[PDB]
């Protein structure tokens, strides 16, 4: 398969000379992509144009996942190649891959405000379309942290502000989960994003920030966005449970310094149970120093030291058991 590798590399490097060489020699992958895919991949408009017009290679070919070359150009953000594919090339802006993603999703997913701005206002792209997971282009820009793209998407399709993916995430949930504070302030201050809209499991954007350790987001939300750190998921788990359980000493300490209680969830487990069960020794210590009740039993009758013992976390058990026999 000597021909394939040379065409794909020449197309990707911008090597018009090799392309016209292979072609004249009558020589024109594993994922079913083509040299048109590789040209579009890094914005070699000249090679891509020669690849379609002169050598008559179709530009509507779909890779294994249904990605045509225009999807490729949008993901990688090379606007000039995408324009040629949609206008002259023969690609249609509403084309979906096998997941439902159009070129405007990809443009948002990989943060290319110019590709997004062109697609919305000159390209005819529909910003109300969901992928099979239920994601709007606005969900991608928020998760990516692309505030310029998000701005365009809020103006073009403002009802997307509180839209939920199939698992219940809003754009705010995704921004908070991913730690994008500027996007988070913009959705709440300027677009009246609801911060109490929960995912399917009962988690709020506050929990997502606590779960992933994004203290800057968590602090802004709790202070300036009418979210309370006593917020609970469907199991009664607080921001402090999620921080402790995933080892986020920064979030945990901030919560504890500004007054959040150390409370049991619906199952009787405190954030110390969660830290011990996941073997987060430093969180166990921070919670113990902040006066967590070491002997509190959950619904199964287990203390935090018990859970640490059962899940093999011997330094957590050792510590908690010895701090208790100190008292």
């Amino acid at each position: 398969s000597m021909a394939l590798e040379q065409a794909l590399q020449a197309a990707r490097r911008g090597d018009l000379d090799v392309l016209r060489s292979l072609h004249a020699a009558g020589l024109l992958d594993s994922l079913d992509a083509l040299p048109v895919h590789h040209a579009a991949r890094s914005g070699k408009l000249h090679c891509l144009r020669y690849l379609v017009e002169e050598v008559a290679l179709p530009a509507v070919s779909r890779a294994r996942n249904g990605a045509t070359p225009a999807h490729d150009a949008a993901a990688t953000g090379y606007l000039s190649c995408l324009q040629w594919l949609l206008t002259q090339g023969g690609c249609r802006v509403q084309e979906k891959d096998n997941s439902g993603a159009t070129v405007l999703h990809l443009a948002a997913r990989f943060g290319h405000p110019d590709v997004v701005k062109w697609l919305l206002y000159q390209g005819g792209a529909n910003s109300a379309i969901t992928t099979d997971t239920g994601a709007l282009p606005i969900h991608y820009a928020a998760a990516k942290g692309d505030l310029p793209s998000l701005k365009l998407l809020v103006g073009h399709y403002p009802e997307g502000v509180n839209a939920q993916t199939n698992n219940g995430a809003t754009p705010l949930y995704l921004a908070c989960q991913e730690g994008h504070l500027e996007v988070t302030k913009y959705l709440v201050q300027e677009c009246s994003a609801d911060p109490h809209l929960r995912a399917q499991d009962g988690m709020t954007p506050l929990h997502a920030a606590a779960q992933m350790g994004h203290n800057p987001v968590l602090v802004w939300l709790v202070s300036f966005a009418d979210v309370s750190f006593s917020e609970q998921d469907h199991d009664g788990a607080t921001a402090m449970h999620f921080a402790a359980s995933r080892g986020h000493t920064k979030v945990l300490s901030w919560l504890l310094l500004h007054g959040a209680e150390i409370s049991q969830d619906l199952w009787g487990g405190t954030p110390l149970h969660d830290a011990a069960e996941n073997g987060e020794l430093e969180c166990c210590q921070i919670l113990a120093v902040n006066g967590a009740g070491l002997d509190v039993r959950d619904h199964d009758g287990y203390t935090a030291a018990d859970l640490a013992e059962f899940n093999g976390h011997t330094h957590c058990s050792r510590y908690l058991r010895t701090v208790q026999t100190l008292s």
Binding site: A67, A75, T76, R109, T131, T133, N167, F242
Partner: peptide, 20 residues
Amino acid sequence: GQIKVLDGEDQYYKCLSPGA
């Protein structure tokens, strides 16, 4: 809880820039 993702683990788009 689990983290909320928008896509599957397919690598076709991520492995399009020279980032793989």
